[PDB]
Amino acid sequence: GPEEITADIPNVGEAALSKLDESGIVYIGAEVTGGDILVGKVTPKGETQLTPEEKLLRAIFGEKASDVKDSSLRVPNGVSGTVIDVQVFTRDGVEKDKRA
Amino acid sequence: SVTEFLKPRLVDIEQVSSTHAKVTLEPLERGFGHTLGNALRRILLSSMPGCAVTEVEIDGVLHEYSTKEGVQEDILEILLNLKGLAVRVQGKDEVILTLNKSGIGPVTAADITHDGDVEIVKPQHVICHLTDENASISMRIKVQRGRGYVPASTRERPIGRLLVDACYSPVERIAYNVEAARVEQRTDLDKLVIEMETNGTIDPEEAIRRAATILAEQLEAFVDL
Amino acid sequence: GVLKIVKVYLAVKRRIQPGDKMAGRHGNKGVISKINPIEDMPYDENGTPV
């Protein structure tokens, strides 16, 4: 499957997603420092067999947390500044998000 | 006697301008003129308290690196202009002023909403310019009291609140001169004239008294030892 | 194989500090060694520091 830019990163907490908009992109004018998430992206991991432990995890914590990885863009250590501009380039035929 | 020193007093205060003054101390013994003058100059240039703008909020802006439609200046230039605003706060250590303006023309310090405890000493201070008839600007300005230079970097906030470095020192420059004083029956006494240039937000006499109090409180540690 | 690209721009302000390189127009370059307080700088008869 394809990689998705999205606001639903299951493992991270609520605060770390406070500066992202509905499309998973940092707001214009936000003050960021090292380690802050700029763009939220998830990489799918796929297995068609569900072990009983995996079934228990899916039942308790939901199926979204499973079969998904984290590959978000983060500010490098020792880098700070203010978000002044964001530009989105989308391939033709692909649905555009709200920010675009 | 030789162990008794004649002590100075504030004799003359001349107001050349609203931001320029002269203070006269007389009489002084041999060598005490420069000794007092250098210390007073250092204390006045280093330790005077004042009020300064620290935070700004504008409705349509998100950060300092943007522009507002109908305003000829960038947000950064507006903040730099606001850094130079001279305000005398007489009742509190923190206040919030409101500015609302609309129509073509310069927006200055006289357009700030009146407050009982806040005095604007330079109403002609230009803040920005509106170049469109259907253009309005509204802002909230946070002013607080302190001393010295505090950059905003050294000191979460919502998006749209802009920080500005605070320079609380009201004194712009200090000079002093020692002349020969004409006392009743002695010719070995001096007179100290202190020329003070400020921003008009502090009285020269209270500044001199505050400097003397600071010097005395710092010196009282050497008395006991 | 590329679906989307997102570019983000960060702006920062750099102030002067010891270790920065200053220069003139006559080949006189140097490095700042100290930031001196205003009352320690030399001044003229009018009290204007350098």
From Swiss-Prot, chain B:
Keywords: Acetylation, ADP-ribosylation, DNA-directed RNA polymerase, Nucleotidyltransferase, Transcription, Transferase. One of its GO terms (biological process) is intracellular iron ion homeostasis. Residues 1-225 are annotated as: Alpha N-terminal domain (alpha-NTD). GO terms for cellular component: cytoplasm; cytosol; cytosolic DNA-directed RNA polymerase complex; membrane; transcription elongation factor complex. It catalyses: RNA(n) + a ribonucleoside 5'-triphosphate = RNA(n+1) + diphosphate. Its EC number is 2.7.7.6. GO terms for molecular function: DNA binding; DNA-directed RNA polymerase activity; protein dimerization activity. Changing residue 182 to C: In rpoA101; temperature-sensitive. The keyword Acetylation applies. (Microbial infection) ADP-ribosylated on both alpha subunits by the phage T4 protein ModA. ADP-ribosylated on only one of the alpha subunits by the phage T4 protein Alt. Disulfide bonds: none annotated. It is an enzyme of class 2 (transferase). The keyword Cell cycle does not apply. Coiled coil: none annotated. Belongs to the RNA polymerase alpha chain family. The N-terminal domain is essential for RNAP assembly and basal transcription, whereas the C-terminal domain is involved in interaction with transcriptional regulators (such as CRP) and with upstream promoter elements. DNA-dependent RNA polymerase (RNAP) catalyzes the transcription of DNA into RNA using the four ribonucleoside triphosphates as substrates. This subunit plays an important role in subunit assembly since its dimerization is the first step in the sequential assembly of subunits to form the holoenzyme. Homodimer. The RNAP catalytic core consists of 2 alpha, 1 beta, 1 beta' and 1 omega subunit. When a sigma factor is associated with the core the holoenzyme is formed, which can initiate transcription. Both the N- and C-terminus interact with different regions of transcriptional regulator CRP. The rRNA transcription and antitermination complex (rrnTAC) consists of RNAP, NusA, NusB, NusE (rpsJ), NusG, SubB, ribosomal protein S4, DNA and precursor rRNA; S4 is more flexible than other subunits. This is DNA-directed RNA polymerase subunit alpha.
From Swiss-Prot, chain C:
Acetylated on several lysine residues in the presence of glucose. Signal peptide: none annotated. Co-administration of salinamide and rifampicin or salinamide and myxopyronin suppresses the emergence of resistance to both antibiotics. The RNAP catalytic core consists of 2 alpha, 1 beta, 1 beta' and 1 omega subunit. When a sigma factor is associated with the core the holoenzyme is formed, which can initiate transcription. The rRNA transcription and antitermination complex (rrnTAC) consists of RNAP, NusA, NusB, NusE (rpsJ), NusG, SubB, ribosomal protein S4, DNA and precursor rRNA; S4 is more flexible than other subunits. In pull-down experiments interacts with CedA. DNA-dependent RNA polymerase (RNAP) catalyzes the transcription of DNA into RNA using the four ribonucleoside triphosphates as substrates. Belongs to the RNA polymerase beta chain family. This is DNA-directed RNA polymerase subunit beta. It comes from Escherichia coli (strain K12).
